[PDB]
Amino acid sequence: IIGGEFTTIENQPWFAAIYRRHRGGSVTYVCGGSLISPCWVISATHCFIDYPKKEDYIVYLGRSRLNSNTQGEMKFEVENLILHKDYSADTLAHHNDIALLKIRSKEGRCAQPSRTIQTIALPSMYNDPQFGTSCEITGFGKEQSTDYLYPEQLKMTVVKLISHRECQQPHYYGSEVTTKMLCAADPQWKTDSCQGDSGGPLVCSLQGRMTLTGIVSWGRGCALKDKPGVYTRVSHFLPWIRSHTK
Ligand SMILES: NCc1ccc(Br)cc1
Numbered sequence: 001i002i003g004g005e006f007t008t009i010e011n012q013p014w015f016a017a018i019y020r021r022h023r024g025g026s027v028t029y030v031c032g033g034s035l036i037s038p039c040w041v042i043s044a045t046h047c048f049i050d051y052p053k054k055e056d057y058i059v060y061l062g063r064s065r066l067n068s069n070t071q072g073e074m075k076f077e078v079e080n081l082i083l084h085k086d087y088s089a090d091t092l093a094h095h096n097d098i099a100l101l102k103i104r105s106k107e108g109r110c111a112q113p114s115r116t117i118q119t120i121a122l123p124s125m126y127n128d129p130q131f132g133t134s135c136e137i138t139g140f141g142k143e144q145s146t147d148y149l150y151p152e153q154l155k156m157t158v159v160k161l162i163s164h165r166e167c168q169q170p171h172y173y174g175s176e177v178t179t180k181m182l183c184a185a186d187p188q189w190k191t192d193s194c195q196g197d198s199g200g201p202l203v204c205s206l207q208g209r210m211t212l213t214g215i216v217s218w219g220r221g222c223a224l225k226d227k228p229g230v231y232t233r234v235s236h237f238l239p240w241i242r243s244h245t246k
Pocket of ligand 1: 192193194195196198216217218219220221222223228229230
């Protein structure tokens with residue numbers, strides 16, 4: 001997250017921190033995700049497509065820090081790693097960039113809701129906020145495009161939704177943005193998602209309900225003029241989510 005503010009998991013208790021074990025046993029951060037039901041975390045396919053083996057992954061809930069334990073956190077294995085079979089990536093845009101992780105602990109349990117672990121509501125089908133609506137994004141991604149390190153402490157910021165028409169202008173993203181994506185940015189371009197924020201939540205309030213409107217997917221750099229963050233438009237994937245979560 002470029003700009004924005006530090007936070008803790010209490011302010012985004014559906015946020016899932018996803019890591020990968022290497023041969024040798026090194027563990028590194030991969031991507032964010034969102035708890036949509038006790039057993040299901042939703043994220044982005046591009047986070048996993050190069051290492052699709054479920055056994056490599058570790059998912060934490062209730063975690064506010066990248067490389068230290070947060071009191072009350074839960075650790076999970078990945079029982080099913082479900083990537084979208086129509087996923088595609090051209091030089092910039094990721095299409096159908098959505099993934100499901102069925103989580104299960106060493107004791108064989110799903111997520112147990114607490115002060116630091118809660119689910120987020122999915123939107124109703126094709127029901128998104130109007131352009132100009134302020135939404136929030138959360139993650140452990142870079143604080144500056146030129147950074148090497150990721151922040152140790154979770155961050156959040158606010159971005160405003162941009163219409164399909166504005167985002168499809170050639171000087172934004174042209175035909176790279178489809179109706180299954182949502183663009184969002186700051187009016188001054190001063191805050192945004194960045195590398196490491198992929199898979200995490202774009203949350204908007206719709207009818208007074210906090211809603212998983214988007215999943216951090218792609219962008220040309222970070223906090224750059226005319227280059228919004230692009231998000232998987234969750235409200236256009238409800239049949240796929242329904243068909244893969246029983
Ligand atoms: N590389 C993932 C990513 C997505 C959106 C923005 Br904005 C920046 C980076």
